[PDB]
Amino acid sequence: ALGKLQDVVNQNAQALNTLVKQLSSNFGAISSVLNDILSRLDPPEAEVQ
Amino acid sequence: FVIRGDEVRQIAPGQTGNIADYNYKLPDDFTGCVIAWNSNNLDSKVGGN
User: Does residue A29 contact residue A37 with C-beta atoms inside 8 Å?
Assistant: First the structure.
């Protein structure tokens, strides 16, 4: 009965969850954790990642 | 200044090593040139300069 409203809530929740999960992708970087990049590589190298 | 040949690379933006860390460090955004030339005929003597 409440399909229209439940779909809206689910869509918003899905958008937020996808946005948050995007933080863990490497995006081509050696790692998805910023502190790990800072520690492992030198500043000149770390800047690119 | 004067260094040894293997230390020539240490004189570069963001470089590391003894020379870069404790003697002469360039900024990450260095805007300039580095010209190095062997001075074995001027800065070396028999017995050690």
Answer: yes
Chain B's closest residue to A45, CA to CA, is B14
Tell me the technique behind this structure: cryo-EM
Min Cα–Cα distance to chain A from B37, Å? 25
A chain contacts of residue B13, beta-carbon cutoff 8 Å: 44
> SS3 for B7?
helix
Read off the DSSP letter of residue B36.
Answer: -
Is residue B28 within 8 angstroms of chain A, CB to CB?
yes
- DSSP helix/strand/coil, B20: helix
| Residue A49 structure tokens | 């990642």
